[PDB]
Short mmCIF file of C-alpha atoms in Angstrom, two decimals:
data_model
loop_
_atom_site.label_atom_id
_atom_site.label_comp_id
_atom_site.label_asym_id
_atom_site.label_seq_id
_atom_site.Cartn_x
_atom_site.Cartn_y
_atom_site.Cartn_z
CA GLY A 1 -12.02 -34.99 -9.83
CA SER A 2 -13.95 -32.34 -8.05
CA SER A 3 -13.23 -28.63 -8.99
CA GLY A 4 -10.74 -29.84 -11.42
CA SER A 5 -9.45 -26.60 -13.08
CA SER A 6 -6.01 -25.37 -14.23
CA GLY A 7 -4.34 -23.03 -16.69
CA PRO A 8 -4.36 -19.25 -16.15
CA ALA A 9 -2.99 -17.54 -12.81
CA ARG A 10 -4.53 -15.00 -10.61
CA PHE A 11 -2.85 -12.41 -8.60
CA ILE A 12 -3.55 -13.48 -5.12
CA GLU A 13 -1.67 -10.60 -3.63
CA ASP A 14 -1.93 -7.16 -5.15
CA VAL A 15 1.43 -5.08 -5.06
CA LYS A 16 1.56 -2.17 -2.64
CA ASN A 17 1.80 1.59 -3.60
CA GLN A 18 5.25 2.68 -4.81
CA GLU A 19 7.16 5.74 -3.31
CA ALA A 20 10.63 6.79 -3.85
CA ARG A 21 12.51 10.01 -4.15
CA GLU A 22 13.89 10.98 -7.47
CA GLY A 23 17.04 9.38 -8.59
CA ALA A 24 15.82 6.15 -6.81
CA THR A 25 14.98 2.52 -7.70
CA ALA A 26 11.27 1.55 -7.32
CA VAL A 27 10.46 -2.10 -6.45
CA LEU A 28 7.19 -3.76 -7.33
CA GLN A 29 6.61 -7.14 -5.88
CA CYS A 30 3.59 -9.45 -6.14
CA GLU A 31 2.51 -13.10 -5.71
CA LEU A 32 0.50 -15.60 -7.95
CA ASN A 33 -1.69 -18.60 -7.08
CA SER A 34 0.37 -20.54 -9.49
CA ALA A 35 3.86 -20.39 -11.13
CA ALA A 36 3.14 -18.04 -14.24
CA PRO A 37 4.80 -15.18 -16.11
CA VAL A 38 3.87 -11.55 -15.94
CA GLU A 39 4.02 -8.23 -18.04
CA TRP A 40 4.93 -5.22 -15.99
CA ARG A 41 3.08 -2.27 -17.54
CA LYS A 42 3.10 1.38 -17.04
CA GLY A 43 0.83 4.36 -17.73
CA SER A 44 -0.84 2.07 -20.29
CA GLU A 45 2.38 0.66 -21.75
CA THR A 46 4.24 -2.71 -21.64
CA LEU A 47 7.67 -2.85 -20.02
CA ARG A 48 10.55 -5.21 -20.51
CA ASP A 49 13.56 -6.32 -18.45
CA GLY A 50 16.66 -4.53 -19.56
CA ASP A 51 19.00 -1.82 -18.18
CA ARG A 52 16.54 0.52 -16.28
CA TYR A 53 13.95 -2.09 -15.69
CA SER A 54 14.72 -5.44 -13.90
CA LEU A 55 12.00 -8.13 -13.78
CA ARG A 56 12.80 -10.99 -11.50
CA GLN A 57 10.47 -13.93 -10.76
CA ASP A 58 10.82 -16.69 -8.23
CA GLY A 59 8.17 -19.41 -8.78
CA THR A 60 5.01 -17.63 -7.86
CA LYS A 61 6.41 -14.32 -6.66
CA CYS A 62 7.49 -11.53 -9.11
CA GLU A 63 9.57 -8.33 -8.92
CA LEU A 64 10.28 -5.18 -10.92
CA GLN A 65 12.79 -2.50 -10.45
CA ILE A 66 12.81 0.96 -12.21
CA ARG A 67 16.21 2.55 -12.34
CA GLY A 68 16.17 6.24 -12.91
CA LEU A 69 13.06 7.46 -11.09
CA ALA A 70 11.99 10.80 -12.41
CA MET A 71 9.01 13.19 -12.18
CA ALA A 72 7.78 11.78 -15.52
CA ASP A 73 8.05 8.22 -14.38
CA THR A 74 5.41 9.17 -11.83
CA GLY A 75 2.51 7.13 -13.01
CA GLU A 76 0.43 3.85 -12.61
CA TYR A 77 2.03 0.43 -13.07
CA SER A 78 -0.04 -2.75 -13.60
CA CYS A 79 1.35 -6.38 -13.57
CA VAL A 80 -0.66 -8.61 -15.80
CA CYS A 81 -0.18 -12.34 -15.82
CA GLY A 82 -3.00 -13.32 -18.11
CA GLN A 83 -6.73 -12.15 -17.60
CA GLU A 84 -6.18 -10.21 -14.29
CA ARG A 85 -3.68 -7.78 -13.12
CA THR A 86 -2.55 -5.51 -10.28
CA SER A 87 -1.91 -1.84 -9.83
CA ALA A 88 0.18 0.33 -7.57
CA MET A 89 0.51 4.23 -7.81
CA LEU A 90 4.10 5.18 -8.12
CA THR A 91 4.90 8.64 -6.61
CA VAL A 92 8.32 10.07 -7.37
CA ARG A 93 9.07 12.63 -4.58
CA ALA A 94 11.20 15.21 -6.30
CA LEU A 95 14.56 15.45 -4.29
CA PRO A 96 15.19 18.57 -2.25
CA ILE A 97 16.92 21.04 -4.68
CA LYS A 98 20.46 21.93 -3.25
CA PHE A 99 19.84 25.51 -4.12
CA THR A 100 22.68 27.61 -2.63
CA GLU A 101 21.44 30.65 -0.86
CA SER A 102 23.48 33.82 -1.13
CA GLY A 103 23.70 36.05 1.90
CA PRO A 104 26.42 38.62 1.71
CA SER A 105 24.80 40.23 4.72
CA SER A 106 23.55 43.31 2.85
CA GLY A 107 19.74 42.88 2.69
#
């Protein structure tokens, strides 16, 4: 009766910034006011569940994993579910190079 509306879903909870060292697996989770699908984007691009990407939803909550985090991957991801969408900067902290120092004790 009153305020009778239904259809599109809005992201009640915006994902949190993403941070993981190179060669890691990011995880973007969010929540919706109502059971609805989503489209995990990236640097202005649409992503899809596959080998590297893993999108999992549980009713109103969503999830997206990124296997193979690299310097390039470092970008901005947005989860769209209709008219609105979220965003969480993903920083890929390059792993500490295992550079082997050589010290023959000469100088």
